[PDB]
Design a protein around this nucleic acid. Structure first.
Ligand code: MG
Ligand code: MG
Ligand code: MG
Ligand code: MG
Ligand code: MG
Ligand code: MG
Ligand code: MG
Ligand code: MG
Ligand code: MG
Ligand code: MG
Ligand code: MG
Ligand code: MG
Ligand code: MG
Ligand code: MG
Ligand code: MG
Ligand code: MG
Ligand code: MG
Ligand code: MG
Ligand code: MG
Ligand code: MG
Ligand code: MG
Ligand code: MG
Ligand code: MG
Ligand code: MG
Ligand code: MG
Lengths: 110, 32, 98, 69, 95, 53, 131, 94, 151, 40
RNA sequence: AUAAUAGUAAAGAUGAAAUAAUAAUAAUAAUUAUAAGACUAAUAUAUGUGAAAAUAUUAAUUAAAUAUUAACUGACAUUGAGGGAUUAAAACUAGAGUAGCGAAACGGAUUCGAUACCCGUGUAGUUCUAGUAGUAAACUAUGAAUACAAUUAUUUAUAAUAUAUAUAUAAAUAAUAAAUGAAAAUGAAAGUAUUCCACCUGAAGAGUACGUUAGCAAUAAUGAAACUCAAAACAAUAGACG
């Protein structure tokens, strides 16, 4: 059943994500982690399409929301930056985008 | 392709490389 | 380089301490002095330092303080020992074997 | 011309079915599959299966690592 | 009854314990065969050819190409030997 | 006298196999098609050959 | 994890080759047996010669006393046992190797599974039956 | 049991040997010389026993330096190979 | 107690490269008083015996016999040098003890060497040789040998 | 520790046999007979 | 590379010599002692594994991977614009290291000349850590997936009929029938069909100019038009030439 599948690969995801944290350099394993995460997304989308009650029950049991399942996820370096997979910046914004954000820092009175 | 067009493209690439090497100073001046 | 608050360092200029002296059966007999002989932080006479070890605070006389390789990031390497002449060749950071 | 080497065939325990990698601790057993200077004989000379030969090679290389060879 | 005396009775054993596999004893009567077989055992270890190839460096791609070429040549020759044997047998059998 | 082109359906065998497991679904072999066997030349065998050997 | 190590313990006391082998085995077995570890089997391969002269702990050793140890311990514990073995000057060469336990829990040493016997139970059964 | 496998060949324009090694025999008048030289080295130059070998050289040399040369055959293995390659090769049908 | 050295065996080394031939004659020296004195352990004496100290006696290349420059790597020059070694050994008369002949890479003078050794000139020196070995040395790993020679 | 001392003493005793593996021993059955006993 | 022991007058390279190192310690060669950088011999087929780039000295920790059976689920699948990650060698930014090889440079050679092919000294590079860039004849010059189609030989795995290796099913390789093709040839496809994505519309201009984007930089991506022409291109055949 979809929920059991999701729970099993959730355990696998936790374990081998812990490994990736331990080994930053390995890239093939990172590829497997991204593929497995996408597989969990796919099965859960089906579970939504079939039995919504179990869908929300299981995603809330594991610790995910409908957002983290429907949206496209690519294991991008921006994801690791935002959610602090390691702890240090990997991507670097150019002065254009940086200054665009700097200017965007309105700090408006509101 | 054969070695005919491969030779032609090689020469064009070489000429472009040399042309861009000679104009290094002008490029620097125009781009500040 | 790696000293941090919490580590333990010791000095052996007087010689092997009493604790090891009564532990000679399990300390000197297995020659596990190598565990503490080549350790970061503790100070030894050059006689007990194995050849090739990276060392600093090198003196000149047995009853003198360290004088060489005290600056930031400085190190010296022990090259040879001459028990007969009571002298040891110490490669020094300037590159002069002394 | 037709002189065969079936004496080996009956006496090579390696092709009997035994796991080569197990024998890494017995230098002699692998010693008969190395030339004078230790070079591993080619599959043709040994004549083992591909998997048996590859495991034998791993065993001897390991045995060299521990230094028995 | 002490050290270094039993040693002299064991030094020879110790010596032949360490052998490189190149050790060769020449016959007193005739030396031609001793060198001749030493020459053959040089070839069987291919140290001549490999030393010749060891004086210069070749690209990894080139060595791979050469290794494949030699393997095919050996395989082709062995196949040719097989066919030659079968034709000799067939000739004898009357075909 | 063996018959070529017959597949023993799961319903045909209700009893447990040698290992005590009841067969309830067709296996990988049943999925595959066997046209080649129909057109393959049959392999002739006689009991007499075993005795002759 | 079941582990199996080849030891090559130096012999300066030619009169007592087992002596320093005895001491080293006692020490590292002690280390493993307090350390949530079980020793499975120890058996010696005897006083045999090194293929080539190896210079260890300031000695160009020609011969060592090879001995066997089969033990169970955690990955961290076994790694540090290897560390102790390498740093200690009493042993000139060492190499651990795991033995897969996914199929059978009891597995004998390499030198034993090389023979007909495949596990410790076979060894004891043969010992009892023959004696 | 597991003998080395048999390796076939791709279809070939022909099957032949460059320079077949055909059987041949030495004159033995050179062998006579070899034996005589051995006798000279051991017994002594033109020593009594060597004299018999000396006369053997004389007999083998008198008419021809290498003596009478015959039995010079050639190997027709190329003929048979070309003859029955088309059958022995085991090529697939057309 | 008191160093008492003596000679036991002799070693003849022959190096043969593409452009030169190098023949070296040395003598094995050992001390028997060494083990008479105590204070040395079992490994000391085996280390001592296993590695026999040697001292060079005769060392010459093909340049010593009138061959200059290009002619140092040919058959004849090596042949004369090999013969020269033998007669030197003869005049030195070190034949008293047997000689061990190690070998080295080919060049072109190996053929000259073994021919002179088995030749009538060396027919009376072979009698003092029992063991022969090859030390043509090879490279298991790598040191990045030079490139091709685009000749 | 007691087991360690006893086993090491037994193993390293000069009287105890050692397998130097110099030669190949010429000379299973007990295991099969025990299996047949405990199976029949 | 340094040091020692003996030990001589030459050693090294080349088709042949000199550039650099020798009887000023006295080399080269041999045997020993110390340090360092780099690399990995047969095995060996890169076989094989890996998405590609890559990947073979040994042991260990973590992660992934195969076939059969049982059960479970229930069309949850294929492809995939945009997007994301990885991506040889060279190159660049900091920090360690630099044995050997080695752009550039300087010398020695051959030639009429030689800005080279050969020889010497050899800086960057080549090596490890953290990075930038995302390019190759990155090639099977052949995107992924599904159903099907006639033979042979060799290996690998599965199944007990066995009596002690015969019998059936899968995969790889090699040679083919049919088919396709401009032919060379492909031959679980380059055949018979279906689905999805990328790309092409004569040569030269030109992957050039301009703009934009991104990079510390070298540069990478995107990417025209004007002038000229009836050219331009592949497979195979027969000579001539080497
Ligand atoms: Mg999916
Ligand atoms: Mg094209
Ligand atoms: Mg531009
Ligand atoms: Mg400006
Ligand atoms: Mg020459
Ligand atoms: Mg030298
Ligand atoms: Mg290799
Ligand atoms: Mg492959
Ligand atoms: Mg692919
Ligand atoms: Mg439904
Ligand atoms: Mg896709
Ligand atoms: Mg895309
Ligand atoms: Mg590469
Ligand atoms: Mg740098
Ligand atoms: Mg160089
Ligand atoms: Mg140069
Ligand atoms: Mg990147
Ligand atoms: Mg491209
Ligand atoms: Mg056709
Ligand atoms: Mg078509
Ligand atoms: Mg086409
Ligand atoms: Mg561009
Ligand atoms: Mg016109
Ligand atoms: Mg053409
Ligand atoms: Mg012509």
């Amino acid at each position: 059943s979809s929920e059991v599948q999701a729970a099993c690969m959730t355990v696998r995801i936790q374990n081998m994500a812990n490994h990736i944290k331990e080994h930053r350099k390995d890239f093939a394993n990172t590829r497997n982690l991204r593929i497995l995460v996408q597989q969990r997304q796919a099965i859960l989308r089906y579970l939504k399409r079939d039995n919504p009650e179990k869908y929300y029950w299981t995603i809330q049991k594991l610790g995910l929301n409908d957002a983290a399942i429907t949206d496209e996820f690519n294991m991008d370096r921006r994801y690791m930056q935002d959610y602090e997979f390691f702890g240090d910046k990997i991507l670097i914004r150019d002065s254009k985008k940086v200054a665009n954000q700097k200017r965007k820092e309105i700090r408006k009175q509101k | 392709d054969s070695v005919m067009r491969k030779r032609k493209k090689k020469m064009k690439k070489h000429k472009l490389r040399k042309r861009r090497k000679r104009e290094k100073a002008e490029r620097r001046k125009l781009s500040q | 380089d790696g000293l941090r608050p919490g580590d333990v360092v010791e000095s052996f200029r007087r010689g092997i301490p009493q604790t090891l002296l009564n532990e000679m059966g399990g300390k000197v007999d297995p020659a596990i002095l190598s565990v503490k002989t080549t350790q970061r932080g503790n100070c030894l006479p050059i006689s007990m330092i194995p050849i090739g070890t990276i060392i600093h605070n090198v003196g000149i006389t047995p009853v003198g303080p360290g004088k060489f390789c005290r600056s930031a990031g400085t190190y010296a390497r022990v090259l040879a020992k001459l028990p007969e002449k009571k002298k040891a060749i110490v490669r020094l950071q300037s590159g002069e074997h002394r | 011309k037709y002189q065969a080497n079936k004496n080996s065939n009956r006496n090579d325990i390696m092709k009997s079915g035994a796991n080569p990698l197990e024998f890494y601790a017995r230098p002699r057993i692998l010693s008969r599959y190395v030339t004078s200077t230790g070079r591993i004989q080619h599959r043709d000379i040994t004549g083992l299966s591909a998997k048996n030969q590859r495991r034998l090679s791993k065993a001897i290389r390991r045995c060299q690592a521990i230094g028995l060879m | 009854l002490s050290e270094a005396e039993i040693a002299r009775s064991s030094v020879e054993n110790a010596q032949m314990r360490f052998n490189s596999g190149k050790s060769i004893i020449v016959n007193k009567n005739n030396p031609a065969e001793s060198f001749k077989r030493l020459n053959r055992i040089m070839f069987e270890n291919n140290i001549p050819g490999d030393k010749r190839s060891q004086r210069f460096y070749m690209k990894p791609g080139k060595v791979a190409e050469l290794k494949r070429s030699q393997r095919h040549r050996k395989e082709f020759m062995m196949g040719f030997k097989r066919l030659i044997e079968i034709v000799k047998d067939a000739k004898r059998k009357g075909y | 006298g063996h018959i070529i082109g017959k597949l023993v359906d799961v319903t045909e065998q209700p009893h447990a196999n040698n290992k005590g497991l009841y067969k309830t679904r067709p296996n990988s072999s049943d999925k595959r098609v066997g046209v080649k066997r129909l057109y393959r030349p049959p392999k002739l065998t006689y009991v007499e050959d075993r005795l002759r050997s | 994890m079941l582990y199996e190590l080849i030891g090559l313990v130096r012999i300066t006391n030619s009169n007592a080759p087992k002596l320093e082998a005895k001491e080293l085995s006692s020490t590292i077995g002690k280390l493993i047996i307090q350390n949530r570890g079980v020793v499975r089997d120890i058996v010696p391969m005897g006083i045999r010669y090194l293929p080539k002269i190896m210079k260890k702990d300031q000695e160009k050793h020609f011969r060592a006393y090879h001995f066997l140890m089969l033990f169970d311990s955690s990955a961290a514990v076994q790694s540090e046992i290897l560390r102790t073995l390498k740093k200690d000057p009493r042993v000139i060469r060492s190499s651990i190797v795991k033995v897969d336990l996914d199929k059978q829990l009891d597995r004998a040493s390499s030198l034993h599974r090389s023979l007909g016997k495949k596990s410790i139970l076979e060894l004891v059964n043969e010992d009892y039956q023959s004696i | 049991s597991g003998k080395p496998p048999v390796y076939r060949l791709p279809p070939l324009p022909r099957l032949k040997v460059k320079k077949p090694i055909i059987r041949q025999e030495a004159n033995k008048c050179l062998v006579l010389m070899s034996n005589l030289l051995q006798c000279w080295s051991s017994y002594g130059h033109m020593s009594p026993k060597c004299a018999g070998l000396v006369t053997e050289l004389k007999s083998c040399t008198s008419e021809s330096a290498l003596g009478k040369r015959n039995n010079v055959q050639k190997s027709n293995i190329n003929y048979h190979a070309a003859r029955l390659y088309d059958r022995i090769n085991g090529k697939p049908h057309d | 107690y008191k160093p008492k050295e003596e000679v036991v065996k002799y070693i003849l080394h022959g190096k043969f490269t593409k452009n030169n031939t190098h023949l070296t004659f040395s003598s094995v020296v050992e001390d028997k008083n060494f083990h008479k004195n105590k204070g040395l352990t079992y490994n000391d004496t085996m280390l001592y015996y296993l590695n026999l100290p040697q001292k060079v006696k005769i060392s010459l290349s093909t340049g010593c016999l009138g061959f200059r420059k290009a002619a140092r790597g040919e058959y004849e020059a090596a042949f004369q040098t090999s013969g020269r070694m033998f007669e030197l050994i003869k005049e030195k008369n070190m034949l008293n003890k047997d000689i061990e002949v190690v070998m080295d890479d080919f060049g072109k003078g190996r053929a000259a060497f073994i021919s002179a050794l088995v030749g009538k000139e060396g027919a009376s020196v072979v009698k003092k040789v029992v063991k022969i070995s090859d030390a043509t040395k090879l490279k298991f790993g790598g040191v990045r040998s030079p490139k091709m020679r685009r000749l | 520790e007691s087991q360690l001392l006893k086993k090491i003493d037994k193993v390293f005793n000069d009287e105890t046999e050692e397998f130097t593996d110099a030669y190949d021993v010429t000379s299973g059955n007990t295991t099969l007979q025990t299996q047949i006993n405990n199976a029949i």
